[PDB]
Design a protein around this nucleic acid. Structure first.
Ligand code: MG
Ligand code: ZN
Ligand code: ZN
Lengths: 91, 214, 137, 102, 64, 201, 103
RNA sequence: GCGCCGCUAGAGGUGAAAUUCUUGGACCGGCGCAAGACGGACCAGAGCGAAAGCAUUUGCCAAGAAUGUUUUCAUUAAUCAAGAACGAAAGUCGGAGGUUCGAAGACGAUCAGAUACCGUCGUAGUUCCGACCAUAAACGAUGCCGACUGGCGAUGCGGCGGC
């Protein structure tokens, strides 16, 4: 059914911690708990291990990505910025 | 107290032997003070020199760049670095009610001299034309532009730097993109606007002293 | 002799001359043909003592008188000219010290080569310092 | 009272033209409101031409042009006097003034 | 600095100036040739056909 | 006690028949079963480690040897990167830019792995309760319950004591203050609520 | 990424209707050894020793390989139904022109 | 902005003037580089979009107006309470990034007084990403749909025919 209107994942804290510190966790905490799509075997089994580490359910290939997510917004830029220096000047 | 201009000397800079006039001018440089030796204290001087002081007949509104690469004592030699048009031409041929088309391309030679070519062109109000808005459609713009970069890729990808740099003193590339576009839309003031150098291949002195021969 | 380049009299030597005619000052910076080696940078704000008159047409006049007396003394005889404006984000009209700088340099003993307006031009670059309603004098 | 039929701005079928910035006072106006002016004045200030040909090393040297487009706000168009206060039945005309080169 | 004083005959007068009617412009010639002429401005009565003595010879033409 | 993970990159030993194992700061994007190359001519991809003299300017560099041959010291934390600007191939002294922002002129033989460090963005979740801050600093040190020095006796802190909770003496002390007096703002150039970001070299 | 991949994928939905085609790894291995395969297609994301032996048996049987620009959940929908698929082979194009195309 | 050389003592800014940057060498000139904004001149009483709005080239798509049609179904239609969608800027929340301009703020000028105009430095903001807010002189100050009622010269898109 519909069980809430404005908490979602942070209903487990309840009446505690405030309302702009449970608004802050609910974007990080659905992000760290979701199952991301594997860029190596197509499936969605990227279950987050300890912080930094990410790991497939199947094909068993462990990627060290973001901390609360999989792809850091800066590290998406960097991998597409390293290869910019790799073809310009050829080094 | 001390004059710091008598501690200088005066070399002279020479154009490549692919032209007519060789005496560019006399640049000046301080002499050797211990660690600072003045040989490579000028290797890399770019000279804002036009064509009518580097040809005899050719137009005045086009200029070359000519970095300095090595020093033979007083005579100091250069190599082609780039070109561009003078600014008084480039915004006199920009008028209202005619669409400028432009194309740019990174095409390397067969010499390890990756070039970047810039070209412009302006549509042509005809003789008996009565209307004033002589514009081109959008699909005519794209396919002239594909035709423009097709031609300068035939002129630069095929053979090395020297026949390329020899190609644009009479500007055969701009005349050829003139002729092969006017079946789509006629053009009239169609130039290679700017050439930019992107790479440098390991710096021999053999290729320097062949370009400074006859 | 040691100073000066060595040429004949029927020939001459070229060194370009940055006439930077912005507003509220004037530069008559001379250099060689490389663009690099500065010969003389005297300034219309240095040869008048007013600060109303840093860009005055009289100021660039006698600045140009001094720089030719320095140019012709060092040995360089003929100039190219590379006049500018304020450039780019700000205004693009060259100030009062343009033609008061060049005719004074012309009348006071100098040969003149290719002259050129080589001021900067952007492609809708940056955002200009006035605010949206502009400076309201 | 609607003063002008087009409302100063010569747009018809749009919602937003690109706002450009005035040339002396740097005020933000739309592109088709702005009082345009294009100046092809000679750089040499043509009183000063037969004072440089004695100094010129060349004999037939084409003196370069100078290409500035001034684009104004309407407030610094009147005060710097490129436009002018007019009359009722002589507002509805889109013609430029006469040239008269000398 | 050291430029000799140049004497000058006027051609056609361009009228009063300075906003009080105290000054005039003569468009003098330099008493050397028929050509090298500058349009200057004096104060006082002109009477076309005189010789007046410019203490320098390179200033300006009036334009605002 | 660390947020950034570690890779363990086994290498073949070119001096005896063996395989030996390292532990690197994991630059972000790597995964198991990836060939990480290392040397002077290692091609400039992510995860590779190669001296800063050969890489071009403006690239993004983590976990560098501050002094050559050190084996990795600068910018090792989770989600950090130093940036090399302005090579100078004579005197072999280039410079980089640390994550603190104080750019540093270093040696040009500093072997230094390419990329940003995995585990980054960790300080953007609130700890949010005292238990996850207990567990954060139970595995690092014994430093987590920090008692305010105003809230203890004069025999135990230079600020404590008095019939209120006040400080009395100004909280900015000089740098050669004796050991046991350097409490509070140690040698502060300025104090108070910072307008701006840094605005000084 | 703008106009003209209306060659490679729109041909592939035509062979979804008309011609005969086998999917996956161990079916497209059983048609490539006994000759009946005509053009194998590898996804981008099949593992590399799987990529380098379907390439190898195609070198033995002297057939063609078209590597695909896309994920196996991007090739899988480009075929036109919902399962992910790495490697497919066509054994007859009905009335498309895959073999007469660019490879 | 930052390197690296060159020269010299002011540069800056104003109706003037100063706060400011300056021989631990600035402004200027030259070669380089990096970052992040931005798409001039071509640009018009031109086009597209329901509106907001929309401009560097090349690259998956998905769509649309109109024209052309001896195509097909044959009233399937117009406006539309309740109800939803998209909605400039500014704003608020979270993360990247921070060049430039720059609310607030500081300081200098101007003034009887300047918490204003002018000057310098400058925070939030601009800039991207994901979530919200639903307002504007959101103006053709004209709801949409249908017909009929003058002319002329054009500009834009098709289609047909012509020296
Ligand atoms: Mg506490
Ligand atoms: Zn997986
Ligand atoms: Zn204005």
């Amino acid at each position: 059914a519909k069980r809430t209107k404005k908490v979602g994942i942070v209903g487990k804290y309840g009446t505690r911690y405030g309302a702009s510190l449970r608004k802050m966790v609910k974007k990080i905490e659905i992000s760290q708990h979701a199952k991301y799509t594997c860029s190596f075997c197509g499936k969605t089994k990227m279950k987050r291990r300890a912080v930094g580490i990410w790991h497939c359910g199947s094909c068993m290939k462990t990627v060290a990505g973001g901390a609360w997510t999989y792809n850091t917004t800066s590290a998406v830029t960097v991998k597409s910025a390293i290869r910019r220096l790799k073809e310009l000047k050829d080094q | 107290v001390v004059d710091p201009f008598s501690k200088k000397d005066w070399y002279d800079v020479k154009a490549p032997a692919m032209f007519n006039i060789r005496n560019i001018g006399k640049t000046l440089v301080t002499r050797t003070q211990g660690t600072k030796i003045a040989s490579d204290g000028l290797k890399g001087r770019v000279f804002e020199v036009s064509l009518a002081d580097l040809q005899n007949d050719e137009v005045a509104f086009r200029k070359f760049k000519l970095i300095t690469e090595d020093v033979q004592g007083k005579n100091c030699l250069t190599n082609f670095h780039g070109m561009d048009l003078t600014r008084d031409k480039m915004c006199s041929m920009v008028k209202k009610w005619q669409t400028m088309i432009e194309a740019h391309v990174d095409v390397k030679t067969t010499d390890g001299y990756l070039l970047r070519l810039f070209c412009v062109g302006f549509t042509k109000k005809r003789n008996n034309q009565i209307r004033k808005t002589s514009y081109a459609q959008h699909q005519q713009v794209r396919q002239i532009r594909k035709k423009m970069m097709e031609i300068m890729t035939r002129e630069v990808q095929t053979n090395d730097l020297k026949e390329v740099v020899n190609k644009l003193i009479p500007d055969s590339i701009g005349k050829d993109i003139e002729k092969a576009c006017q079946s789509i839309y006629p053009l009239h003031d169609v130039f290679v606007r700017k050439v930019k150098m992107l790479k440098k291949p390991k710096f021999e002195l053999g290729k320097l002293m062949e370009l400074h021969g006859e | 002799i040691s100073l000066g380049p060595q040429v004949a009299e029927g020939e001459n030597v070229f060194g370009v001359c940055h006439i930077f005619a912005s507003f509220n000052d004037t530069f008559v910076h001379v250099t060689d043909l490389s663009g690099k080696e500065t010969i003389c940078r005297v300034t219309g704000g240095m040869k008048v003592k007013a600060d109303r008159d840093e860009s005055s047409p009289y100021a660039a006049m006698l600045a140009a008188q001094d720089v030719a007396q320095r140019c012709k003394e060092l040995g360089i005889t003929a100039l190219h000219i590379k006049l500018r404006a304020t450039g780019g984000n700000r205004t693009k009209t060259p100030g009062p010290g343009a033609q008061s700088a060049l005719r004074a340099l012309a009348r006071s003993g100098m040969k003149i080569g290719r002259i050129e307006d080589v001021t900067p031009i952007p492609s809708d670059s940056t955002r200009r310092k006035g605010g949206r309603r502009g400076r309201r004098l | 009272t609607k003063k002008r039929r087009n409302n100063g701005r010569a747009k018809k079928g749009r919602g937003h033209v690109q706002p450009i910035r005035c040339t002396n006072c740097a005020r933000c106006v739309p592109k088709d409101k702005a009082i345009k002016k294009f100046v092809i004045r000679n750089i040499v200030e043509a009183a000063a031409v037969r004072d440089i040909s004695e100094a010129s090393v060349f004999d037939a040297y084409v003196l370069p042009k100078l290409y500035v487009k001034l684009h104004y706000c309407v407030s610094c168009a009147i005060h710097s006097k490129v436009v002018r206060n007019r009359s009722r039945e002589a507002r509805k005309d889109r013609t430029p003034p006469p040239r008269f080169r000398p | 600095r050291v430029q000799p004083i140049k004497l000058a005959r006027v051609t056609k007068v361009l009228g009063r100036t300075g906003s009080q009617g105290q000054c005039t412009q003569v468009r003098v010639e330099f008493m050397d040739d028929t050509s090298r002429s500058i349009i200057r401005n004096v104060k006082g009565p002109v009477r076309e056909g005189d010789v007046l003595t410019l203490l320098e010879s390179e200033r300006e033409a009036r334009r605002l | 006690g660390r947020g950034a993970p570690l890779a363990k990159v086994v290498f073949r030993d070119p001096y005896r028949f063996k395989k030996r194992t390292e532990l690197f700061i994991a630059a972000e994007g790597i995964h198991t079963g990836q060939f990480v190359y290392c040397g002077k001519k290692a091609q400039l991809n992510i995860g590779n480690v190669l001296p800063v003299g050969t890489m071009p300017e403006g690239t993004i560099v983590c976990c560098l040897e501050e002094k050559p041959g050190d084996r990795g010291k600068l910018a090792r934390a989770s989600g950090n990167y130093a940036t090399v600007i302005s090579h100078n191939p004579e005197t072999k002294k280039t410079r980089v830019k640390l994550p603190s922002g104080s750019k540093k002129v270093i040696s040009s033989a500093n072997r230094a792995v390419v990329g940003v460090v995995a585990g980054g963005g960790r300080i953007d979740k609130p700890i949010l309760k005292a238990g996850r801050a207990y567990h954060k600093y139970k595995a690092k040190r014994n430093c987590w319950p920090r008692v305010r020095g105003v809230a203890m006796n004069p025999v135990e802190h230079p600020f404590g004591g008095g019939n209120h909770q006040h400080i009395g003496k100004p909280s900015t002390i000089r740098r050669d203050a004796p050991a046991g007096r350097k409490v509070g703002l140690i040698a502060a150039r300025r104090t108070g609520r910072l307008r701006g970001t840094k605005t000084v070299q | 990424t703008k106009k003209s991949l209306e060659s490679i994928n729109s041909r592939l939905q035509l062979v979804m209707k008309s011609g005969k085609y086998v999917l996956g790894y161990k079916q497209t291995l059983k048609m490539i050894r006994q000759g009946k395969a005509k053009l194998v297609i590898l996804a981008n994301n099949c593992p590399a020793l799987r990529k380098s032996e379907i390439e190898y048996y195609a070198m033995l049987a002297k057939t063609g390989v078209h590597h695909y620009s896309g994920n196996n959940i991007e090739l899988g929908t480009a075929c036109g139904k919902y399962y992910r698929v790495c490697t497919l082979a066509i054994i007859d194009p009905g009335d498309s022109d895959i073999i007469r195309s660019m490879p």
